[PDB]
Design a protein around this ligand. Structure first.
Ligand SMILES: [Cu+2]
Ligand SMILES: [Zn+2]
Lengths: 228, 390, 100, 53, 52
C-alpha cells in the first residue's frame, strides 16, 4: 500500500488547534465579564458548566481510547511483517506529534496563560476561568493522547508489546505527577508553614527506541549504502 | 472581587475602612478619576496575619482597565512598600487615569507582607471611549515625553525577533545538512565524524564569532542611546504619618471608649446582637450613628435621617439602635446594639461560624447633635446561636 | 491508590472526631470540646501556640479548608508512595556481601 | 504463596474471584464509611473548628 | 601620637537615622569597634550608650 499515511495525524492537529482556538476565543468573550465573580450565576452558566462536563467526558474519553486499543490489539504481534511494522511505527511517530501539540497547549499556552489571570483577579475559590481550562481541560487531554500513544505502541509494535519501555511508561504516567507540582505550587503560602526537578522528556528514550527499530528495519542496503 | 469568600473574622479584625470616595463614577479614556479614603489598623491584629510593618496600597481592578497615575497613603507618595502601625488610622488616595472601555468594580485594597490582600470598598466605575486613544504620557529627567502605553515595545521586538530568527536558522541549517535518521544512523554505525568535523566546526567558529560581535555592537549602541540609566528603585519607605484629626481613635482630648461585653449572631441569619460598654469622655452628647466591619456600613436611620452616597452593597440602614439617649459627657453606660441586614449575610460575615477564631472587629461611629463624629474601635468574642430553618 | 487513601482519611476520622467538635461557651468565648479537653487535662509541656493547627489566612476562599487539605494530601502521597515502594524493594534484598 | 510466586505462578495465588472478594470488600468499606459519615453528621450537626490564635 | 603602651582614647556620638533602610537589619543587635589594620592598638575597654 504505502508506509507513510499522515491522514490520521492531520485529523488530530486540525480537530485540536480548532478546539483550542474556539476555547481561547470563548474565554476571550466570556472570560471578560461572566467569569469575574464566582458568586454570580453567569459563572455557573459559562464556566462551572464547562468543568462539570469535561472531567466526566475526559475520564470516559480516556478509558475509551484505552479499552479500544487493547481490544483491537494485534493478538499475534511477533509475527508482524517488516513493512507493516514500519507503517505501524510511522503511526506511532504520528501519535507522538499530536502528543507534541497536546503538550504545547496544555503545558505552555494554557499554563503560562494562568500567570496573567493571577494579575487580574483575587480568586473566589481555586476554580478560576483559567484553571478550568489549564487544569481540568488542557492537561487531561494532553495526558489522554499520552496514554493513547503508549497503548497504541504497546498493542501494535513488538518491542512495546512484551515490555513497557520505561521511557514510555514515564511519559504516560508523569502527567499524573504534575498536579503535585504545577497545582500545589499554587497553594504555596496557604499550605505553607507545615512545609533539580522531576520531568518528562521521557519522549527522548521513546524516540530513541523508535529510531533503533527503523535502523533495524532497513538492511545494510538502505542503511550504509543509500544513506552513506 | 473575592471579598465575600475570605474568612469573615480576618476581614473584620484587620483593616477597618471608612470615608471611601470615588471622585467620578463615569469616565472617558484618559479621564483622570481619583479614589480615596481612610483606614483603621485594628488593634488585636490576628496571629494569622503578619505584622503590617510592611504593606502595599493598591486599587482592586480587573487588570489595567484604569492606569494608576500616582497613589498616596499616610501622607506619602506610595509607589513602594510602607509600614502601618497597629492601632492607628491612615489616609490614602489613588489617581486613576481611565483606559479600558467598560464597567469595572474598583476597590480600595491593601496587601500585607505575610498576610495577603485586604479588600475594601469597591464601586462600579464606568469608562467610555476607545482604548485606541489611551495614552499617558510621562516625562523623563532629560526633559522629553513618552507614551508609556507604547514606549519601548518597538526596541524589544527589534532585538528579540531577529535573534529568535537567528536561532531558528541555526537549527534548520543542520536539520537539512545531516538528517535526524541519517545522523542517528551515522552515529549508530561506527561514525559519526561523517556527521560532524570541520568545516562544520569552521561554520560554528564563524557563527560564534559573529554572535559575539553582534552582541558587542548591540550593547555598545544601546549604551549610546540612553547613556543615562539608573537601577530599579525599591525598598520600604520612611515610616508613615497617621491621621491626627480628630478623632480618629485614641487621638486628642475628646474621645469615646467601647468595650465589647458579649454578643450573639444567629446561624444561619442576618442578625448580630451585641452589648457595648461605652464611656464618653467628650464634652458633648453622643448617639451611635454607624458600625463598619469589612467596609459595610451599618447605619442608625435615627442618626442618618438620610442616607449617604455609598455603593449598594455594602450599605445597611439597620445598625439600630439605642433609644437615641445621647449618653454623656461624663457618662459610663452599657448599651445594647442590634445589627440586622441582608448584607450581613450576603457578604458572608455570617460565616464567622466557620472561623478558627469566632470574633468580631471594626469601628463604631458616634455622632453629636451637630455634625461632629467620634470613632471608637470595637472587637471581641461573639457566640453563635443555631436556628432551625435552613 | 494513594489519591484515595488521601481522601478517605478525614471522612473515615469524622465519626470519631465530630463528637468533640461541638461548641461550648467559656467565660464569654467559644471553644470546642476538644480545645477544652486539652485545656482541662493539664499537659506539663503543651501550650496552645505549639499546636501546628489551622489558624486561618487571607488566602482561604470558601468553605474548602478540608477538601484542599485532603486533596493535597493525596497528590503528595502519590510521590511518597513511589519512593516507598522502591524502598520496600531494596529493603527486600537477598543480596550477600563480602566484607565489613 | 511464596513458592507459587517463586515457580512460574502466581495467578495460582491471585486471580478473581480473589478480585471479586476485593471489589466486594472494597465497595462495602466505601459504603460503611459513607454511612458512618452521614450518621455522625446527623448526630452533632452543629460543630466548629478548633479555636486558636 | 603614641608610645608603645601609651593609652590613647577615641570617642564620639552617633545618631541612629530614622528612615532606616530595608536593606539593613534593625540595629536591635549591634557591636562597637575601632577600625584598624589588625591589632596595631589593643583595645583596653570600650563603652557605648553609657555602658561597658
Ligand atoms: Cu468588586
Ligand atoms: Zn492559577
Amino acid at each position: 500500500e504505502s508506509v507513510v499515511d499522515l491522514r490520521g495525524m492531520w485529523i488530530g492537529l486540525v480537530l485540536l488547534n480548532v478546539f483550542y482556538l474556539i476555547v481561547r476565543i470563548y474565554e476571550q468573550v466570556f472570560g471578560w465579564r461572566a467569569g469575574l465573580d464566582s458568586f454570580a450565576p453567569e459563572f455557573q452558566t459559562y464556566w462551572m458548566s464547562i468543568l462539570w462536563t469535561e472531567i466526566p467526558l475526559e475520564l470516559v474519553s480516556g478509558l475509551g481510547l484505552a479499552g479500544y486499543l487493547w481490544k483491537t490489539r494485534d493478538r499475534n504481534v511477533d509475527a508482524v511483517t517488516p513493512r507493516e511494522e514500519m507503517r505501524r511505527l510511522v503511526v506511532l511517530v504520528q501519535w507522538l506529534v499530536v502528543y507534541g501539540i497536546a503538550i504545547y497547549w496544555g503545558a505552555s499556552f494554557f499554563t503560562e496563560q494562568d500567570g496573567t489571570w493571577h494579575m487580574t483577579v483575587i480568586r473566589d475559590t481555586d476554580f478560576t476561568p483559567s484553571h478550568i481550562i489549564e487544569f481540568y481541560m488542557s492537561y487531561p487531554i494532553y495526558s489522554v493522547i499520552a496514554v493513547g500513544a503508549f497503548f497504541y505502541a504497546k498493542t501494535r509494535i513488538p518491542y512495546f508489546a512484551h515490555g513497557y519501555s520505561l521511557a514510555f511508561l514515564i511519559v504516560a504516567i508523569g502527567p499524573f505527577m504534575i498536579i503535585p507540582n504545577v497545582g500545589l505550587n499554587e497553594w504555596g503560602h496557604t499550605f505553607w508553614f507545615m512545609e533539580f526537578g522531576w520531568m518528562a522528556l521521557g519522549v527522548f528514550g521513546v524516540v530513541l527506541q523508535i529510531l533503533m527499530r527503523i535502523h533495524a528495519l532497513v538492511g545494510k542496503e538502505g542503511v550504509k549504502l543509500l544513506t552513506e | 472581587h473575592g471579598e465575600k469568600s475570605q474568612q469573615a473574622f480576618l476581614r473584620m479584625r484587620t483593616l477597618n475602612w471608612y470615608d471611601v470616595q470615588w471622585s467620578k463614577t463615569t469616565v472617558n479614556v484618559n479621564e483622570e478619576m481619583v479614589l480615596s479614603g481612610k483606614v483603621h489598623v485594628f488593634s488585636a491584629w490576628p496571629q494569622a496575619v503578619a505584622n503590617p510593618r510592611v504593606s502595599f496600597l493598591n486599587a482592586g481592578e480587573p487588570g489595567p482597565v484604569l492606569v494608576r497615575t500616582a497613589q498616596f497613603i499616610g501622607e506619602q507618595f506610595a509607589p513602594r512598600s510602607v509600614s502601618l502601625e497597629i492601632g492607628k488610622d491612615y489616609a490614602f488616595s489613588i489617581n486613576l487615569r481611565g483606559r479600558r472601555a467598560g464597567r469595572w468594580h474598583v476597590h480600595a485594597q491593601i496587601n500585607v507582607e505575610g498576610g495577603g490582600p485586604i479588600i475594601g470598598p469597591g464601586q462600579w466605575i464606568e469608562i467610555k471611549g476607545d482604548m485606541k486613544d489611551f495614552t499617558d504620557p510621562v516625562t523623563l529627567l532629560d526633559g522629553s515625553t513618552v507614551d508609556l502605553e507604547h514606549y519601548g515595545i518597538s526596541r524589544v521586538y527589534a532585538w528579540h525577533l531577529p535573534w529568535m530568527a537567528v536561532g531558528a536558522a541555526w537549527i534548520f541549517f543542520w536539520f537539512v545538512r545531516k538528517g535526524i535518521i541519517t545522523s542517528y544512523i551515522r552515529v549508530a554505525e561506527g561514525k559519526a565524524d561523517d556527521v560532524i568535523g570541520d568545516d562544520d566546526r569552521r561554520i560554528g567558529a564563524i557563527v560564534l564569532a559573529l554572535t559575539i560581535l553582534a552582541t558587542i555592537v548591540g550593547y555598545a549602541v544601546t549604551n549610546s542611546t540612553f547613556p543615562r540609566t539608573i537601577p530599579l528603585q525599591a525598598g520600604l519607605q520612611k515610616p508613615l504619618t497617621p491621621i491626627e484629626t480628630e478623632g480618629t481613635v485614641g487621638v486628642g482630648k475628646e474621645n469615646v471608649t467601647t468595650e465589647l461585653n458579649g454578643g450573639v449572631y444567629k446561624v444561619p441569619g442576618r442578625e448580630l446582637t451585641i452589648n457595648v460598654k461605652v464611656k464618653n469622655n467628650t464634652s458633648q452628647p453622643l448617639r451611635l450613628g454607624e458600625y463598619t466591619a469589612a467596609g459595610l456600613r451599618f447605619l442608625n436611620p435615627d442618626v442618618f435621617t438620610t442616607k449617604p452616597d455609598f455603593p449598594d452593597y455594602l450599605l445597611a440602614d439597620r445598625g439600630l439602635s439605642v433609644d437615641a439617649t445621647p449618653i454623656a459627657p461624663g457618662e459610663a453606660k452599657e448599651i445594647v446594639v442590634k445589627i440586622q441586614d441582608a448584607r450581613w449575610d450576603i457578604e458572608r460575615l455570617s460565616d464567622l461560624a466557620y472561623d478558627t477564631d469566632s470574633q468580631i472587629g471594626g469601628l463604631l461611629f458616634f455622632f453629636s447633635p451637630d455634625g461632629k463624629r467620634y470613632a471608637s474601635e470595637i472587637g471581641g468574642p461573639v457566640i453563635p446561636k443555631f436556628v432551625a430553618g435552613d | 491508590g494513594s489519591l484515595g487513601w488521601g481522601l478517605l482519611f478525614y471522612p473515615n476520622n469524622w465519626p470519631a472526631i465530630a463528637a468533640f467538635h461541638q461548641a461550648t461557651e467559656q467565660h464569654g468565648q467559644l471553644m470546642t470540646l476538644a480545645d477544652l479537653i486539652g485545656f482541662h487535662f493539664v499537659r506539663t509541656s503543651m501550650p496552645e501556640y505549639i499546636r501546628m493547627v489551622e489558624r486561618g489566612t487571607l488566602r482561604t476562599f470558601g468553605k474548602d479548608v478540608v477538601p484542599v487539605a485532603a486533596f493535597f494530601s493525596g497528590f503528595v502521597s502519590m510521590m511518597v508512595y513511589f519512593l516507598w515502594w522502591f524502598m520496600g524493594r531494596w529493603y527486600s534484598t537477598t543480596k550477600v556481601i563480602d566484607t565489613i
